[model samples]
Target: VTNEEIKTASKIVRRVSNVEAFDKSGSVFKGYQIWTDISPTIENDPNIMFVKCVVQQGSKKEKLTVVQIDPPGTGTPYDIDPTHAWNCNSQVDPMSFGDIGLLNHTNIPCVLDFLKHRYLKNQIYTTAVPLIVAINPYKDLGNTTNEWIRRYRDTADHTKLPPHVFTCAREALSNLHGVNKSQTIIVSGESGAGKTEATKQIMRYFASSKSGNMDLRIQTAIMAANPVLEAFGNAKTIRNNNSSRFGRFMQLVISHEGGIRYGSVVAFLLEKSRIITQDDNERSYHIFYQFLKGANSTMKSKFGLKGVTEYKLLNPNSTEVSGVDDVKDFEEVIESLKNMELSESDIEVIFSIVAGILTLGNVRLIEKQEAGLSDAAAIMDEDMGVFNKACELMYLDPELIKREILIKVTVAGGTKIEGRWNKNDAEVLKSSLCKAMYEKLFLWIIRHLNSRIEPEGGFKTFMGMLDIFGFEVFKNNSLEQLFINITNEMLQKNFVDIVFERESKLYKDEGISTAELKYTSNKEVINVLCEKGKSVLSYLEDQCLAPGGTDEKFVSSCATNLKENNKFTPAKVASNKNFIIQHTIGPIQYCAESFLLKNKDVLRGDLVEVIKDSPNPIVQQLFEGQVIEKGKIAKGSLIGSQFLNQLTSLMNLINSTEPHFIRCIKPNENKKPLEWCEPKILIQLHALSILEALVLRQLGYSYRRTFEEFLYQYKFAAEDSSVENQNKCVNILKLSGLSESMYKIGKSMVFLKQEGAKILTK
Candidate 1:
């Protein structure tokens, strides 16, 4: 055949046989093959000739026999080398390698290969099948732009473009609209892992996509909420200069038409303890430093503010974090507040509360003898100035504030008795009051912001973004670390439930036989912490309720109840007051010295009454409802119980939505750009269960479909008459050249291997 005839014949074969024919080099297609170096023998029929050719369909290959309508031995024989048939450039576009499911080998090395490949392309965002992994590049990669946002906007196929946070955002938006249900994107990682920034990017995409021309103010407020939250909720920690000290879950309510209706922000477990203490090289919440550095002269005089060295609450050793300008951040906070439409009076009240906390921290209690006193009582003569300043800011009378601190009020059998407190007891009360006030103030700020941003029209569905504290194993783990780690474990449990457990159950229900695959579950760790009757929290609650209960008693109860459990360890030294909990990440030894006081969280009734009657509406609202019996303050829920309740609520809220995981990873602790630390990366990958998730995606049936959906997707592969019969479907699939091992015919659905599912769908 001529060259044109050869091309025409090749096109005809591709159309008729649904296969692709290639030349010997696999670089071009020709209708017939010729042996150029070999001499051909003349045949009896000169018009007919035999030839060899290669044909391919998807991944299946075959050799074909052909008869040509040409004279035999008329054309020169082409010397085609067989060795180069399968040898072609295998290089693929790094961006086009969107999902790990597309990789031939879905192992750690392959996963890392794509990550490093994309990293070199300045693309820090990549997907591990369904999971989104974001590496902190520590530099601006320019991936987050309006152009990219527009590109990912309303796009149905996530694998069409390079992996991005916008991809996850688009998926969430698509799922919410497609399923008409809520969706959540979980952004989690260690400190400085860019979780916060990723969450911001996700929100930006949502706000930009959902914001119509109707209401731009609402969109602005929604975007401004981040800086406000960071100013008040984040602080400088050892690992991160701008570390978020609180867990935030923001829900964006959207209409059925995909317009932004409103937004709500819920904060969980703010690290109030940091208000009273901080480790070396760490500062308190950014607001404190911002306020002191940025306050005007008049405001400073009014709040009695000085430099950072004047206040005890602010970190004296480290007044500022590197690369952070608190004065500039304060301006940002003010703008965000104004954008949220906060009233000037309310802003002043917020500042007053902050000042009150600072002044209260400076008040020093000392043992002193009073006139006609049998023993020494707590006195604050020199610190009275600071005490009065705090009282003035909180709208409490100086006399009442001093009395509340020095005297303990108790009620027995409907009788009230007042007794003087020693210096030690007074100091504890002072710190407790500081922590409680700061916590209430933080809640009030959230409420105030919600009032401004919550949509007026009821939402049809919402998309939630959860940027919670990640799994932490510090050098010295305490109750704070315990709660943080427990929260992470619960999230992991939920992930396992949705990804593995539910998928496996679906297989069983569909009557598909699946080999049991073992994966790590945090169920054991969760039960050890939050289980009823046998959990550490339960034991602590019992001890708190017990009469004359103490931290020592709580420790003793823990030793007795959890001694046999491998996750618990009692103190080795008799003089030491501490215990250890073996969390999923590692064992954490916690000091139980102040566990009782912190758990009880008790406040004097008189103090509550004083603040309840304050002239300021903000102060009154904070302490208006008094839960007191006679003069004895009713004991509120323990801290552990409170945290568990909040965590459970958070889990339910998350489980209600279709969850998308974005596991952020910090490349290095030093926050240097383009410097990859292998050990740190490996540890984070294992901690986030990325490797295990990848394994499950590779070995397990990663894609499952209902009967109707399966039929709709691959109906062309089977006969038109085969409707819904499971056996007939299997036979049809086999007849269509699909191997039986690639899929399982469940009772009501079909399960396919990851690659098989990709091929069939395409």
Candidate 2:
């Protein structure tokens, strides 16, 4: 079948027969119009249509029918029949639903409510129900390994998208004239939105779907990157434990020969302040969970972890962050670390190092003969003492640690005076050191990855999945604002180049030069907000780097920069870093100067070199850094293995991949966990489903069919139906999946209503 035919055949079927309510004034859900607005023709709009008959074989048969009634003034007495009919909320076969051209935004709670109990039940029946079963299997799902492998061997078009929208990814890749060695996909969403899981599936697809022999090195590197990213980027939130807290964009490079070459990571929107402290009911995920669960006695002693309950930072009860059964998540993390090739020793060392960060947070500092800086006084605080213990555990020289913590800023001329240390600087230094250490540990894993992917150039193709939070405007915006705005601009630019320009090329091929893809993509909005419009980063850089600059100067610089640079010519500098914009629950100020100065060390060298020399194969391929010549290491051999090891060890420390992001939103007072809705489901399901789909698709089967069929079939009949006993089984199914918890509640509700006289609504 042609692409158009395929789209028609694969369209989603509708279960609701007729529109109960219409017009913007009376509709409960206004967003339903969004679907109709994007679709072709008023009749094809899935929101207003009903399911018709399936054209699977010789004859088309109707399974369920929907009817429309006219209002009092309309004069029509009988109900109008739908073109096709089927049971949407029933136990009918999924395949029978067929292609009914209607799109239902069921993922939205209000929209879902419209589809459920509100419709006239006796007048119409729904044959198709929302599917909520686990569908993918290499890691979690329903197919056999052999079947999965067979599916992997097939080729897919990968270029089919929605109508009016063009999938010009192929043309974009080609536009590089083959100079573009890599392509990255940045997927960002909120927690339980399935970012990590989605990422896994994307990688799986990239790995299995590509033709010819696989680039083992790059595959290994990219695979290795995930565990490290998860370890550093994820944490326990109210929605899901081991949830990613930042944004990550991974780069996948393909060679001219159609082979995978290298992969790299760029992280965004790191919640660094959380490291120092957290909200009263909230605690840092790394501190409370990773430490308490992952650390051993020796490791604990070294890092000075007393336990979760002991630390003021930890909470016995769950916070707004969900899905944290710390014990379970901790175990999952352990397996993840192992999969990333972290040895027992490595795990211990890493934990000890993280423990050091907790210790750093608690360090007691005093003003010691200096202004604007803080020095570590004595180890009075228990947490601070733990920091020392971690140093001892690592066998690091205390003096060196002290040196790292105390910055010695030497005056250029004027007798070359040195700046003294103080308490604030000590805290800053301690935190910086801790941050550095985590970044180092992160890079160390990447360095190990380089070994496997580098030498023979065997690894190729990478699908980078970035999960970062969206933008936030706060009362006092600072460096975070500057960076986020800058990042957003970059993403916008990318959208233009990848989404717009490439699609333009596609239209040109189809003899539609008037497509005007650029205008439609809305690149101007981002440009004005970011580089050309405001030039926030450039101004900040100038203010910081310029001698004797004021805060006002910095602010003014941003304003002036925006006014002056808005004339195009691409305003911001491109870096390996990706941005993740996020909003905070409370007010926050950005320390523009501090952030710029803090990241100065980044100019030294990227962290990819470290992964190239690590013991892990997965780390090697994903390491994006300069390769050292073989001869460079030989010279150090005579200096002894220890010295050679140090030289090699330097290369083993990879930088933190760009920032992986996670956006956290303040929960509404009434919106508790039990009141979970479809926005939550959409985010989580989208992530997981996308991952499974991408991975399975790469393995070569028409995964869409399998995915749709699997979801529709067993979801209602799975391990105990939670909605079975309810008189409103379909209602309960639409509300929650047919899970045990949902079914129990539904059945209980029926009993409560029947048993109680005052159960009526006001």
Candidate 3:
């Protein structure tokens, strides 16, 4: 049997079992169309065409069932079948859905399919009215070129452009002048979803905006601050190749003439624990690895550099990333700091502090046992060169620090009391000092960057770009995860208050009704976790007190105090170590193992005092305003409490501006191409409240304005549009093709629905 003759086996059994049927490939045939699940038609994947039966001159008895003969890529963008699974309007060049608001069908599957198809087509941006959802292409798309940026810059109408971060930036800049309000673009997403990229893109657009000549230096420095911050703040994680572990709200103060003015960076909640320890598959901050590889021979010896594996904080196997060049990145960071106008000395101090931390990690404490002493003594001495090296790098007196590491001397009125530490406690003290110092260095670096790049003159209007972590829920969560979720809860609350609650009220004001604008309750979670004195945080604060309070005691107290609250769940078994909290995103069972230590993360009094006495100016500056008064330990120093206040300050700043949101989506884990896990993405979508956003905008009018404003915007539509207030507005609406039901005339306002407003927009 030959292959050609056997291939015709399926065609041997035709429907009528006659000689009428023949191959459609230039062979005589008469066919009829019919539909069935077994053999769908070429056009249908549904309706199969029927024909008379004829033997195909086959050598074998088995039939090949020659069906689905049509080649792929032949389908049109708008499938004639309304029920086609891949229904889209992508036949046009550079296919994009600028906003999904005007789309008719809204659901999880519909949205997911729309984004997935667009992602594969390289159209990575789409919006749901108030949101801009960016699908991160694991590789750079090169779509946001200078030509594209110029187009978005000069275009009067954004509809001419695709949905893009540049368009979002352009819109904000356009609105900034007329509105004269400080606008903020809040970019949020899960780890590795490229929120930082969105923020950077926004800055580039603003930087390229018509900022007058000679002020280019201001723009350059503003742009330059990013790499400097990223090297210190970003790290390699299981999810993101370069994840920003801190929250940065970078604001650019723009002058009236569009000249780029002052720029400031305010960062929050730098993940402190990562400085001392990291997960097996994760790394410490990128700067450490960068310095080790990138420093020149003289600088390497100056910083007391060692191999990556020598430091306890730097994970050996996890330090290197797939394509990231640490040495090259470090060189870029050095140039970036210079752009921010930091002196060479300032840069040196920054690296020297990092070196001090690395060497400090290698400083070991041995227990000295003696016949007279029952308790093991914690002694860090000159047996090894690491302690001396760390002290020398930080410019601290090595002998003083070695003598003081094992004790805390607190001044009590006129007297002083010395408290001793065990060997384990002393080791923890070393780690604690390292963490505090790294965090302080990070803050100081931003502070100096701000002062250096601060504009010479005052400017009232500005734009704040918030690049923060999205909602996070890990397999095993911690205090970091909890606070991060709380930040999200606060952001989610803003969405609800504006999109759902506020809109529903406005709909009623315009005499339009909605069936309850349903949204998830972020209010309950925030109050449960963030309420001033009544929150579970207070319970943790109490643990900070009471002499010998521990992590286990902290949870038990919360269990008793908040027993009736549904959001807070204590460990089921009395001895269990973790507690579950129903966060905004999901339920996260946080291990309380390190809660007390993390909550009260502070250095020993002796360590702080010795460090404050350092000869290095930057080293002494780290502890400048820290409390050194008489106390058992400083009161109300819970890191959580400090973080809570910092969150409020940021929220207040955001609230002071007109806020826009950019929500990013990471399509898949393991950085695969051409696909996404729907169930996982569906979770983030719902948590984002996008479904409610779609429904609310779809069913109700989005923009509302008074007759004067409406007439001013749409006056070109009607000759007599200048206003008898209501009559002129009515004529304008009529000329603008708004049907009676599509709009409304109120006491002092005119409300137009999406369909009606779209005409005026064009």
Candidate 4:
């Protein structure tokens, strides 16, 4: 029969009958164990052109019905009913794969396939066994709905459901409750990777998990602190408009009854450099524009402010960010400040400090027409105008402010010496003052928020969330980048130690026979950067202390000390004052243009004296104890040394808690939705150590149980198993027909693979 005739017959049969046709060729129709095979009936009579064949419904016997028709064009093609088409290859839920451990291949391609599958489905969260791999959707996916939160909340076993940030949160909470130990969720990724969003969602789940009897005020204040902190701590960047330039570690204090009682925030490494300078298309802190755009006529008049474009510090060619209403945000900040119980006076202090910064940025330097006139050269007409406004806000003398910027006072051999500041020196001083003011303000805000959020009674347990800057390797690295990269390396070292090295050693010591996997550790990189005596930071600190130390000298010292170290590479040209450090992810060549100056970060003693004597109590408090009795700069710690100290303290804090990891992924460079750039993603995967994480997870055990608990779980496997008898674990294993290779008996606990754990429990 012609194909058109067959198609006509199939269409007729489908409309008349309810059965689906499986045959694509339409030559035969089959459904529900019924089949009708068709072929052109051969007949000499033109009237008898077709025949019908059928099978009995309930009997095995076949039946044939005779049908006659005219020529093909003259008659209907046997009014047979058409059946519905059934497609077996329909779309399936990406979560059906459950854990990535079940994938057929444990390679990069397979992993990418799994991630891409979920990405296409708009499911950004996936499981690498223990770690949650989250891809930035670049848009709201509505996955964090109240219903989803309820689904993950109070879940008995998180692994029974799909992967989510809430799942990670619940897991951390469960560990804290089950073990009665502190927990930490380290949410880390590159810029614009949604680390902040992940952290916020985790905090939301914790707040929601609290008991009904808890004071809602504490929770409200804790939540309120976030926006307030963001307004001051976040800024617009090329990668993310609402990027958090600082690192935050928020500790959510939980009670024994599973309620959030209090919360504390510890901020690290605020990008103070951004206060004075920003990249193209990037702005300073969000608070700047927020204040300028949101300030009422009264406040504007008070600060002598007009618009953001009028101030160099606030102007980055663009003021307003897409989808963000600065005025509305400012109102929210005010509301949050009220919620945090900050008084009107305190709010005024904060805004006044911000206004001072804007005014300070307008300070200008000009050479005097009259030669040998130091005081006259120090005071410029335009600068005096701006300085007076700044003094009005900061409650300082304009003359003193101008002098602090225009002069450098130092003590040498118990003798006070004053030297006029050149244009460069004056500009650096201005930037330094701005950064210090903002840093102090940020710290005070945190302290104030914590005081308000601190519960009536202390908490028993706590969960900490670390949302820090991920590994950064820019085109030209600096001292700031050095510190940030070192911090990331330190975190990487800690992660490897806890997850792989420590766990593997425990398995081996416990007599477990498992294949050892090779993984990269960033210990050497950390040593090269922060090691006590011989590291680069130590050398830089030493240079900062040396008289007349310069960036050129700093680079020379690095080349001298670290010449033999493979991680260190000096600049090729003598004029180039830069050095390259081989980081764990890649090598970064840092320019030492102002390395020593930035490390020293010295504010003139006279400047400190002026700030300390300010009428504003907050300003006075900021410069308190910074000056010694002799006004010899007080010998405060250098920036590098301070950072090292803080980093060490942070490491101790993280080490005290059991860590849970969430590695965020950026899908594309363009930040487009539903787009996957394989090369870009592959680079990130490698840099983030995701492949290594997977290997460790797939080959490692999920749970380590004590001998008593092991026996308790598999009591039925060995009825005679006793807690006192350590051999009971072996007995239970043997009784259950489990191979010795399935588990290893450590000194106190039995470590089992995920599959082995499931089998023994069953």
Error of 3 at 699 (Å): 4.6
lDDT of 3 by residue, 1-762 (tens): 223222222222122111222344534233311111122232342111221121223211222222221223222221121111221222222243466665544444446656766888878898887888887888888877777777888777777787888766876766787788888888988888889888877776676655455457767788888887888898888888789998888777765344456788888888888888899889999999999989999998777698877787898878778889999998899998888888899889888889998998887788775434445545556635887778788778877776666665656676776666667777877788788889888888887777777656733677878887776755567788778888888887776566765577776775665553455566667777887666777777777866888888888877777777788887565435778888754566778778877777866465678878887888887877776642545554667877888889889877777768888888777676666654456556755656657766765455577777776675532235424777877887788776776787765677776667765775
Q: Each model's number of backbone clashes?
A: 6, 82, 7, 9
What's the TM-score of every candidate structure? 0.77, 0.52, 0.78, 0.77
Candidate 1 lDDT over 203-299, as tens digits, reads: 7777664346466677778788888888888988877888988888888875543445588889877887798889889998898999999989999
Off by over 4 Å in 3: 1-96, 255-259, 378-383, 408-419, 455-459, 500-521, 563-566, 569-589, 699-762
lDDT of each: 0.70, 0.38, 0.70, 0.71
Give the top-scoring candidate (lDDT): 4
For candidate 2, write residues 602-648 as lDDT tens digits. Answer: 21112234334434443343333433432112222111222223322
Candidate whose TM-score is highest: 3
Worst 10 residues of 4 by lDDT: 82-91
Residue pairs in collision within model 3: 10-64, 10-65, 14-53, 16-53, 17-53, 41-47, 41-48
Least accurate 10 contiguous residues by lDDT in model 2:
122-131
* Candidate 4 residue lDDT tens string, 400-451: 7777777666777778687676666677777888888888788878877877
Off by over 4 Å in 2: 1-183, 205-227, 238-242, 251-269, 298-304, 311-343, 367-387, 403-409, 412-419, 454-464, 470-478, 481-485, 496-534, 547-551, 564-762
